[PDB]
Amino acid sequence: GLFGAIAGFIENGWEGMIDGWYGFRHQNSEGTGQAADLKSTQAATDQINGKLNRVIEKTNEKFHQIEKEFSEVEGRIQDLEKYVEDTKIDLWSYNAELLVALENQHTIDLTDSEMNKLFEKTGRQLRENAEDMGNGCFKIYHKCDNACIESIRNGTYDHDVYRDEALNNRF
Amino acid sequence: GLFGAIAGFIENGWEGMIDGWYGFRHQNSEGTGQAADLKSTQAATDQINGKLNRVIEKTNEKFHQIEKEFSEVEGRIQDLEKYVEDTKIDLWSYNAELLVALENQHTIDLTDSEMNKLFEKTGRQLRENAEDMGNGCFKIYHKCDNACIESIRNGTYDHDVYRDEALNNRFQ
Amino acid sequence: GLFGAIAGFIENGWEGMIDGWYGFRHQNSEGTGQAADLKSTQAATDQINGKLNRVIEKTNEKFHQIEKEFSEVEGRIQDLEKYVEDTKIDLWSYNAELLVALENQHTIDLTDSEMNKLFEKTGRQLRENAEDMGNGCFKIYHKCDNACIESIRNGTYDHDVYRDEALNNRF
Amino acid sequence: PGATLCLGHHAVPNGTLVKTITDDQIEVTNATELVQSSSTGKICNNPHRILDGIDCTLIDALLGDPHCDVFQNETWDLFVERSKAFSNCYPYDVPDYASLRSLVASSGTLEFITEGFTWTGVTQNGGSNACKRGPGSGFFSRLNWLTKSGSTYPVLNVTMPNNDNFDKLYIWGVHHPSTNQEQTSLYVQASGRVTVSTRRSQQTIIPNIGSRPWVRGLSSRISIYWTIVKPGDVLVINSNGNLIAPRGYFKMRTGKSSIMRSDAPIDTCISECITPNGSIPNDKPFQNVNKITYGACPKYVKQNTLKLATGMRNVPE
Amino acid sequence: PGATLCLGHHAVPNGTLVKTITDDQIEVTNATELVQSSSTGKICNNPHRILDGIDCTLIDALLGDPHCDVFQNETWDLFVERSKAFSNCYPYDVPDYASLRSLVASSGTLEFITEGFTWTGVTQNGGSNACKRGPGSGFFSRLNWLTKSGSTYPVLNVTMPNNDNFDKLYIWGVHHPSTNQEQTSLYVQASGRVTVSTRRSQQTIIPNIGSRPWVRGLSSRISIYWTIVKPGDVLVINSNGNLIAPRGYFKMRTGKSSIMRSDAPIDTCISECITPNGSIPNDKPFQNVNKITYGACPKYVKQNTLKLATGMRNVPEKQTR
Amino acid sequence: PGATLCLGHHAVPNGTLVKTITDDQIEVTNATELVQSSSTGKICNNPHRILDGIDCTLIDALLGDPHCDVFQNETWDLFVERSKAFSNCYPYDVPDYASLRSLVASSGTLEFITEGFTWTGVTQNGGSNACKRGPGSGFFSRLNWLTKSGSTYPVLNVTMPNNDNFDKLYIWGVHHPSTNQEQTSLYVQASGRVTVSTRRSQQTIIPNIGSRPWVRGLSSRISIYWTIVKPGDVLVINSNGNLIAPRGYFKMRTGKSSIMRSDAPIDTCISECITPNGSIPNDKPFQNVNKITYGACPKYVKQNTLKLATGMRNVPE
Numbered sequence A, C: 001g002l003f004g005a006i007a008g009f010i011e012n013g014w015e016g017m018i019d020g021w022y023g024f025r026h027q028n029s030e031g032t033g034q035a036a037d038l039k040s041t042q043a044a045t046d047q048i049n050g051k052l053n054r055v056i057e058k059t060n061e062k063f064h065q066i067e068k069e070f071s072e073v074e075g076r077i078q079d080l081e082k083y084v085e086d087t088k089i090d091l092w093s094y095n096a097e098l099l100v101a102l103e104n105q106h107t108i109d110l111t112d113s114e115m116n117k118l119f120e121k122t123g124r125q126l127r128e129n130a131e132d133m134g135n136g137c138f139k140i141y142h143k144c145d146n147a148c149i150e151s152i153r154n155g156t157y158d159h160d161v162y163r164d165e166a167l168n169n170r171f
Numbered sequence B: 001g002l003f004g005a006i007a008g009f010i011e012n013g014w015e016g017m018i019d020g021w022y023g024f025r026h027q028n029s030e031g032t033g034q035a036a037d038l039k040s041t042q043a044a045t046d047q048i049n050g051k052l053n054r055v056i057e058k059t060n061e062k063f064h065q066i067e068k069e070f071s072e073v074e075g076r077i078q079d080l081e082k083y084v085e086d087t088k089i090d091l092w093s094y095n096a097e098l099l100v101a102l103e104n105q106h107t108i109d110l111t112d113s114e115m116n117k118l119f120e121k122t123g124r125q126l127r128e129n130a131e132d133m134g135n136g137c138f139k140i141y142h143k144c145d146n147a148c149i150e151s152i153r154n155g156t157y158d159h160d161v162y163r164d165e166a167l168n169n170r171f172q
Numbered sequence D, F: 001p002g003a004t005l006c007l008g009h010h011a012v013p014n015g016t017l018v019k020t021i022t023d024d025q026i027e028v029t030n031a032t033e034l035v036q037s038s039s040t041g042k043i044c045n046n047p048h049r050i051l052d053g054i055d056c057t058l059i060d061a062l063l064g065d066p067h068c069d070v071f072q073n074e075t076w077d078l079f080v081e082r083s084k085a086f087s088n089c090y091p092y093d094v095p096d097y098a099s100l101r102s103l104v105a106s107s108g109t110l111e112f113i114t115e116g117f118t119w120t121g122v123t124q125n126g127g128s129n130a131c132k133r134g135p136g137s138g139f140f141s142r143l144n145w146l147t148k149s150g151s152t153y154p155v156l157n158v159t160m161p162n163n164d165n166f167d168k169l170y171i172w173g174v175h176h177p178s179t180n181q182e183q184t185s186l187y188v189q190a191s192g193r194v195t196v197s198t199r200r201s202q203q204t205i206i207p208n209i210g211s212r213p214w215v216r217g218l219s220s221r222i223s224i225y226w227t228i229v230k231p232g233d234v235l236v237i238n239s240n241g242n243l244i245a246p247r248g249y250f251k252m253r254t255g256k257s258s259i260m261r262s263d264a265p266i267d268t269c270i271s272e273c274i275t276p277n278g279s280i281p282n283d284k285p286f287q288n289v290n291k292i293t294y295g296a297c298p299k300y301v302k303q304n305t306l307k308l309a310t311g312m313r314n315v316p317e
Numbered sequence E: 001p002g003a004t005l006c007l008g009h010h011a012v013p014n015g016t017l018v019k020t021i022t023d024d025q026i027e028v029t030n031a032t033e034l035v036q037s038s039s040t041g042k043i044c045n046n047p048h049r050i051l052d053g054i055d056c057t058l059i060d061a062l063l064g065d066p067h068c069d070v071f072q073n074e075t076w077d078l079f080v081e082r083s084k085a086f087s088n089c090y091p092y093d094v095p096d097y098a099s100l101r102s103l104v105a106s107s108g109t110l111e112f113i114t115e116g117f118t119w120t121g122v123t124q125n126g127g128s129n130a131c132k133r134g135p136g137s138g139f140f141s142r143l144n145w146l147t148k149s150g151s152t153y154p155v156l157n158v159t160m161p162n163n164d165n166f167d168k169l170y171i172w173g174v175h176h177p178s179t180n181q182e183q184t185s186l187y188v189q190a191s192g193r194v195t196v197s198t199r200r201s202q203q204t205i206i207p208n209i210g211s212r213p214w215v216r217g218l219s220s221r222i223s224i225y226w227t228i229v230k231p232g233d234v235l236v237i238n239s240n241g242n243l244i245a246p247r248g249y250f251k252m253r254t255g256k257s258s259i260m261r262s263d264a265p266i267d268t269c270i271s272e273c274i275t276p277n278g279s280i281p282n283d284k285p286f287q288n289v290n291k292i293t294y295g296a297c298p299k300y301v302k303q304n305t306l307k308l309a310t311g312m313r314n315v316p317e318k319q320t321r
């Protein structure tokens, strides 16, 4: 994708993550753990539901049309009836092929984008108390107990609290 | 949008900004103020004007065609004339629907992109003399009088000048 | 482009770079030099080959159709034959115009994206041992001999090795 | 001693392939199918009124072939013609059969209103052994085979104004005898003619005498024609022989009615979309079942599958 | 004592909803309408040459129904047929009416060149009280009703070569009398025939005797036919009765000409695009006014509105209100 | 003493302009052309079977105009009709010429099977000086001009059943004499008639006597008709004059065959796509050469050029 997170600087997905699309894995003093991020998951699924509902908007109700199969050779009028239908079918087949290609390219790019957005949001939360390892992981330069992790994950992490501790561990 | 600035890390727009699409608000020693950024505004409006002029390029002129309303029941030939026109109309209606959907998605993403570009450009100007608060605002760690702000805004800010002052205010 | 690298914060291209699409120029103790980055170049060309092969997939083969030129005036049936073909041609001409416009916009954006990806990847490699000048160049705050440059370029640069040296030169 | 915080995304062990701008096949966590490629094999009897033709074509039900008399009172949204249908009355052709079939199918009714045509100086109600009714000879129920009375067939000249607010469809014909002997025997005059007209239009038909292949005992034929009369217009029929006369008109409507050729059985179920293969669901925007459809249907395309990605790129561990 | 520098974007108090890939309605600062959904109700008289048919169909002007004589030799880019038009001459039909109307409409001219046909041994210039021209009986101006001279109607056999470098359109007809008495009274022979041919094509029409509905005093009819003669080809007309003869030919052209059914009045203004509802502007790429159009027109679509976003996403400051 | 590491991208001195969503002209490093706008001017003789009509229309080869005898039994994927083609046999017309031409072109064969019609009491093999074959008078090879034997032309009444498992195409005609003298001289009866029928169809044609313009010595004409006979059906031909009889039937096929009007010469080369201007390559998805095409062809569009970007934005030094 265009943002380079999914199948990019993040090496792979997590098969073990079943309660969300994006999230967090950590190691601290108290061990390891995993939690889904609801907001980013929601932003992706809401966008995909949106496009899904636009694509399947029932738009086509037709009754009496032209004949499209013929039991007899007739020449000119039948050549035209067939050519009309064949033309229509090719144009719609093209529309269908293009639509899915554009939609799918965009779905890959928007999901990649939401991964990237969560990563940039986290980095911004952490200010000078952490560094980007470059593989989707932050090294946090202070004691971050399970309460501190949940604070990063649920948006309540005050960086000033740990700043001096972290600044000294970094420099 | 794809970049996460507009309706993302920037909480909302400024109704008070009427002379530009993107810009700067500041607080310093001398108070507060607002200025439009012309370059980013121009990049967005130029792109939107471009797509608008592509979409309204007049490109069809038709004269004698087929009949499309009929006062008599005729059967086969009339079934075909109607089916041809109905087919055409549905295909063009689809084209129109897709076009606006793609254009509009792209317009939202390109405007989001220009916001993000301005933000990354500013952050780069400021080097180590400032930190990203994460809400579209930089905390600048030195005395930045109105001259210093205009220097950031008009591209002339020398970061080396204030670096020692700022480095010391940032690290303790 | 959407990422702001090509024709953005990178002022211009390098006509002298002929062995790759993206790459590195350096200045150190031992002089100046240039090398192509193969990975980023490959990611762009693979994507462009992909779209090129999708666009030129031969997809229509037609045999007996309708007549499209006429030596006699006939009226109603001929009006319809011509209108059918004119309709088809306008629709396909529209498809062709839109296709190239979307493809080209996307090709510009994906190439811009790969430039940006390489730049973010490099910045991450360098950790605290360098600063972004804002014009596509990193100022590296330590002695980086030709071996050290090739290490950055070929992915083997250990930042911890030079960190103290660089941290002190920066602060 | 600090901490590590890793950002990531989900994956599944078995993803699905989709197409994009740049890739013919790329793996995503999930996708949904946009092309309906299957059918139950049955035509659902709701919500559209389905009329099964069984042994009858629409045209045979219209003319009133005896084995099709059961269709006289009938209406439909979709008339279904079966491949086993057969004709079993006077041998006939319809120049522009396809148009007559289409316009009747589209009208959606065989509602027939008898009119008191006065046919002075001819014998009415001719019948044939090719078109049996009961123990005797018979004919199309909606047509009136006129022949000589005594030794004369005078010029027939009748009118019927349309003072209703709907269009009237008149079905009539011309008899093509196999020999001169039969022409003069039935109609006196050596050459017939049928002229049927309205204020602005006319059809004039000359009968054709000659031997044809035998069908149900006969080398003669009837050719069937039609005339629509609009409100305020008038029908005139003029003939000095070979007229197969209308008994009345069919009341025309406009609406959603059509016709389909299919051998699929009809079933008690609900489906908006009908194809000759049977009903299909319409939750998907495209279908590859049949280009012939009726109702609220997905659009026909050539691809048998098209996957819309409903998740991110799948990068398993 | 530091400083804060906040980056941002504008918002507007009154945004508009647009559609995207992911949202059927989302708010942007501004948008522009791509579907033309209104008309003035009037057909602009420029830049296309508009010919108002008034009381006449194109076919009646072609044949030369007397109340249509003012249309002799007219030209048009667009002939406009009105719902009040009426015929007031000999009752007629045209098999393939639609095709004749189309080809004449498309040619864009009724320019007529009289030719010196020699009709030996018949009476020319027949007239009827169903087709009054001034106070007395008359006929279609471009047709010549031939009847017997004395007590005979000989076999007519005439030729007209096309030695010009343009195509000639000939309009001719066949008379269908209502009774045998009328047939023999006018043409002597009990059954007429009209054969009109060129080198490669031929049309033979047999008249049919019988009543049709009474129109302006008559149960007889004329059926109208046409024949195009190319440069170097030759017209031959052969008949022993019931010929309604051409007086000449119409000059055919090719170009931008057409025909439209409309009751909209014609007005002094400028518009490239014309619909039956009236002229419409063509600054937008789509329109929902009418699928019938003439000129440089937006393409017809079913949607009555489509909004192209012309600005960013509109994000007002949320209020506690 | 540090170091600088600059990231960058390539540029070229001479870029190309392309179109995007936002720009009608913007410069990229490279692009490729999507519209085929040129041709060799020649029709490649492979891989499609090309049959050059030379001086003959398909219809003249079908009927068997003598200068077209070389086309007897030919087959084609594409029959090519030249603007220099001429007719040189009895003057004729075909009502619905375009349909007959189309259906034969599409069948792809002129394979003709002679059948033993018995024409009792008439003279066969009539000829004309307008249709010379060798030095003497002749006729269309697939048609049999029947005239009187002695002083009589009896009613002809013959049958040919279709007991094969394929459809038969019969070509037949009607002679239109210029004078009464010619009519009675050739057919005795003052007015002919031709009735050709199957179980399901019948065509009856009355000849029309009169002058037409002179072509190759003649003011008379032949009108050409056709009848398809399906397996199990039967042809019946009934006539008391003016019959131009079939000698047999054409075998019909279905497949990829067509016809094209072109003056482009045929060459020994390989091209899937053929236009009247000549063969064109099919590596590009679009073409602006001709809307008339045959084979695996790019789709016709109005643009003469469309550039697909194959590289990044070009920002030279």
Ligand SMILES: *[C@@H]1O[C@H](CO)[C@@H](O[C@@H]2O[C@H](CO)[C@@H](O[C@@H]3O[C@H](CO)[C@@H](O)[C@H](O[C@H]4O[C@H](CO)[C@@H](O)[C@H](O)[C@@H]4O)[C@@H]3O)[C@H](O)[C@H]2NC(C)=O)[C@H](O)[C@H]1NC(C)=O
Residues within 6 Å of the ligand: D157, D158, D159, D234, D236, E178, E179, E211, E212, E213, E214, E219
């Ligand atoms: C074949 O059958 C039809 C139907 O029976 C028949 O046509 C009818 O003939 C009469 C007499 O020609 C027509 O009557 C006319 O009707 C109109 C109104 O629509 C009146 O304007 C006419 O009235 C004036 O003229 C009369 C002279 O005939 C005067 O007696 C009268 O006082 C008025 O001045 C006139 O009554 C009638 O319209 C037609 N109907 C139709 C549907 O055509 C036709 O004549 C028959 N043909 C033969 C050869 O028998």
Ligand SMILES: *[C@@H]1O[C@H](CO)[C@@H](O[C@@H]2O[C@H](CO)[C@@H](O[C@@H]3O[C@H](CO[C@H]4O[C@H](CO)[C@@H](O)[C@H](O)[C@@H]4O)[C@@H](O)[C@H](O)[C@@H]3O)[C@H](O)[C@H]2NC(C)=O)[C@H](O)[C@H]1NC(C)=O
Residues within 6 Å of the ligand: D179, D211, D212, D213, D214, D219, F157, F158, F159, F234, F236
């Ligand atoms: C002109 O030629 C026509 C064709 O030869 C003549 O028509 C033939 O006339 C005879 C006697 O009148 C008919 O005899 C009947 O035949 C049926 C059989 O019907 C069909 O069944 C078999 C299959 O079982 C099928 O293969 C045949 O082809 C038949 O179509 C008998 O059962 C009856 O008893 C009856 O006698 C012929 O059927 C008929 N042939 C055709 C092809 O129509 C016609 O009489 C001649 N006209 C004149 C005026 O002389």
Ligand SMILES: *[C@@H]1O[C@H](CO)[C@@H](O[C@@H]2O[C@H](CO)[C@@H](O[C@@H]3O[C@H](CO)[C@@H](O)[C@H](O)[C@@H]3O)[C@H](O)[C@H]2NC(C)=O)[C@H](O)[C@H]1NC(C)=O
Residues within 6 Å of the ligand: E030, E031, E032, E033, E310
């Ligand atoms: C936001 O978009 C709307 C379009 O929906 C813009 O409104 C349009 O703006 C111009 C005025 O600058 C109008 O064009 C002018 O029209 C007059 C006559 O009406 C003509 O004399 C001028 O030469 C010119 O063509 C246009 O009519 C108007 N349309 C509507 C429907 O309001 C609006 O200006 C845009 N706002 C911003 C801030 O860009």
Ligand SMILES: *[C@@H]1O[C@H](CO)[C@@H](O[C@@H]2O[C@H](CO)[C@@H](O[C@@H]3O[C@H](CO)[C@@H](O)[C@H](O)[C@@H]3O)[C@H](O)[C@H]2NC(C)=O)[C@H](O)[C@H]1NC(C)=O
Residues within 6 Å of the ligand: E157, E158, E159, E234, F211, F212, F213, F214, F219
């Ligand atoms: C009906 O009228 C037409 C035209 O007046 C007659 O057709 C013409 O017939 C003559 C022969 O009688 C043709 O003349 C011939 O021309 C060739 C050269 O083209 C010449 O070498 C011969 O010596 C011969 O004179 C003439 O071409 C032909 N004209 C047309 C326009 O077709 C027709 O014969 C008349 N029939 C009756 C019964 O009145």
Ligand SMILES: *[C@@H]1O[C@H](CO)[C@@H](O[C@@H]2O[C@H](CO)[C@@H](O)[C@H](O)[C@H]2NC(C)=O)[C@H](O)[C@H]1NC(C)=O
Residues within 6 Å of the ligand: B069, E037, E038, E039, E277, E288, E289, E290
């Ligand atoms: C332009 O004219 C068309 C056709 O006359 C109008 O659409 C018709 O309006 C009737 C109202 O009774 C509708 O019920 C029909 O569905 C329409 N008829 C046809 C033939 O489409 C149309 O509304 C007019 N548009 C404008 C902008 O004036």
Ligand SMILES: *[C@@H]1O[C@H](CO)[C@@H](O[C@@H]2O[C@H](CO)[C@@H](O)[C@H](O)[C@H]2NC(C)=O)[C@H](O)[C@H]1NC(C)=O
Residues within 6 Å of the ligand: C069, F037, F038, F039, F276, F277, F288, F289, F290
């Ligand atoms: C292929 O042949 C067609 C048919 O002749 C050419 O089209 C003609 O050329 C010019 C426009 O290009 C016009 O003056 C003619 O009127 C065109 N005729 C028709 C019927 O369209 C076409 O240009 C040729 N193209 C090439 C590449 O040879």
Ligand SMILES: *[C@@H]1O[C@H](CO)[C@@H](O)[C@H](O)[C@H]1NC(C)=O
Residues within 6 Å of the ligand: C146, C147, C148, C150, C151, C154, C156
């Ligand atoms: C990459 O760079 C180093 C140091 O310049 C070089 O010696 C080495 O061979 C290269 N590759 C690997 C995989 O170490």
Ligand SMILES: *[C@@H]1O[C@H](CO)[C@@H](O)[C@H](O)[C@H]1NC(C)=O
Residues within 6 Å of the ligand: A052, D030, D031, D032, D310
């Ligand atoms: C895949 O997508 C469809 C449509 O959104 C959904 O109904 C289905 O539950 C999804 N499957 C999985 C395994 O999540």
Ligand SMILES: *[C@@H]1O[C@H](CO)[C@@H](O)[C@H](O)[C@H]1NC(C)=O
Residues within 6 Å of the ligand: D069, D070, D071, D072, D073
């Ligand atoms: C049609 O309706 C009438 C009157 O209601 C009825 O008597 C007659 O039997 C019906 N015909 C059929 C075929 O059901």
Ligand SMILES: *[C@@H]1O[C@H](CO)[C@@H](O)[C@H](O)[C@H]1NC(C)=O
Residues within 6 Å of the ligand: D037, D038, D039, D276, D277, D288, D289, D290
């Ligand atoms: C439906 O019927 C058509 C024609 O009989 C057949 O070719 C087609 O494959 C059928 N498709 C399905 C899915 O049953």
Ligand SMILES: *[C@@H]1O[C@H](CO)[C@@H](O)[C@H](O)[C@H]1NC(C)=O
Residues within 6 Å of the ligand: E072, E073, E111, E112, E113
């Ligand atoms: C019509 O035009 C022709 C030739 O241009 C002319 O001879 C004829 O008299 C004209 N008639 C009228 C009424 O203008």
Ligand SMILES: *[C@@H]1O[C@H](CO)[C@@H](O)[C@H](O)[C@H]1NC(C)=O
Residues within 6 Å of the ligand: F012, F029, F030, F031, F310
């Ligand atoms: C453009 O296309 C191909 C590379 O894929 C090559 O043949 C050609 O030389 C390229 N031109 C330039 C200027 O890069």
Ligand SMILES: *[C@@H]1O[C@H](CO)[C@@H](O)[C@H](O)[C@H]1NC(C)=O
Residues within 6 Å of the ligand: F072, F073, F111, F112, F113
């Ligand atoms: C036409 O077809 C077959 C050969 O398969 C044969 O009956 C007949 O003689 C052939 N004639 C010619 C001229 O090839």
